[model samples]
Target: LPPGWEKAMSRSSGRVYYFNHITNASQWERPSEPARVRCSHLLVKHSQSRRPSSWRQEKITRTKEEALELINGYIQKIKSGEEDFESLASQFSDCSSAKARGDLGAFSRGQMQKPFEDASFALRTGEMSGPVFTDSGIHIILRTE
Candidate 1:
């Protein structure tokens, strides 16, 4: 039930409806609408990143060279099927999303960094982006839904 709404039945047609007592707004059924993308990603921060700090480590001071190297290794692990993306991300992603198996939640346009958003929407479901760069870090993205 809504704050100002209550269920009601019609006298003539035996139809069901809902009404808002404070206004003319009414409905014959539930209401809702919107769209968003669901995806997961493993973020690896470098010394040159915006903050360069993540839940993985409070004082992330790794150089971009090493960050890229590490990211490359992760990509290999995933590509070879030697490791699962969720498990790998859970153990090493610099982003706090690691706790969620790297899930960033369903997000819409303008909610993410430009590069990240672009790559996100470009990938098909059940696919992964090779390796993408954002001001925050290097990322390995997975489009799950």
Candidate 2:
């Protein structure tokens, strides 16, 4: 946990496995698709013990220059159209939305901070915005496209 912030503190568990999908030429096999290397990461979040509030987060913004960097990176990812929502969020977002694939859903206008609320509502599905500064740090938001 960092200053001005606290984890919603959840708990989770799951079986993680590795699968190699390939046709080994040494095994006298030919595959339609080339043998590719990949890994399936299994992740789950959980909460334990009594908590006051789930959304009581802090330090959700960054310096102006840092904000710009996040914004630019996110925009590039959107244009490339190959970025995974959760991966990006987990790497960049300063909130629990990281755990939820940035799926904040439709929150009431005032439910979120002014800047955040404004940013989220302004975009359509599949779009993203920010590098917006709040108390937390710079934020790069992506909508489901």
Candidate 3:
């Protein structure tokens, strides 16, 4: 395995697969990169999230529709100049990484959920995304180094 890769095999079917810890991918071939991308993210969790609980809520009872509304609400604050990305992330982001004000640090390829990773990879410095959905819930992604 490379620094962030692992190899595993299915016991019953005897099929081998490669896992990339950095990108959250399990594949049939050796894993590789899209080069390093860095970003900060504001996450919101809802009742339908794969793991619904977050640092902000022990019991997330809101529906996905409501969660999307919350993230959009944050966007409004940023767009209206009442808030900035880091400010909202520090006070309200759901991920535990919020202490760094949503800084997810630098990562290459598969370490993140597919949509999150793709958005991070696609954005240039200072570009922020609208709500992007993933198993974690909705997010406001800011591409930063």
TM-score top scorer: 3
The collision pairs in model 1 are none
The residue-by-residue lDDT of candidate 1 on 1-145, one tens digit each, is 6344568887777799876443223456742213677999999999899997888788889998899889889888987899999999999999889999999989988899987887777655776776678899888888788
lDDT of 3 by residue, 1-145 (tens): 6544578997777898865444343456664434897899899999989998988889998999999899989988987789999999998888998999999999988789998887777655776777888999889888886
Model 3: which residue pairs collide? 22-110, 22-111, 23-110, 23-111, 24-110
Instruction: Estimate every model's Cα lDDT from 0 to 1.
Output: 0.80, 0.40, 0.80
Please, what is the TM-score per model?
0.74, 0.46, 0.75
Model 1, residue 16: C-alpha shift (Å): 62
Kindly report which residue stretches of model 1 are placed more than 4 angstroms away from their true locations once superposed: 1-35
Tens digit per residue, CA lDDT, model 2, 17-116: 2211110001111211112211111111112112212243332233456545655666567557777646766555545565665556545555665655
lDDT of 3: 0.80
Quick one: RMSD of model 3? Answer: 12.1
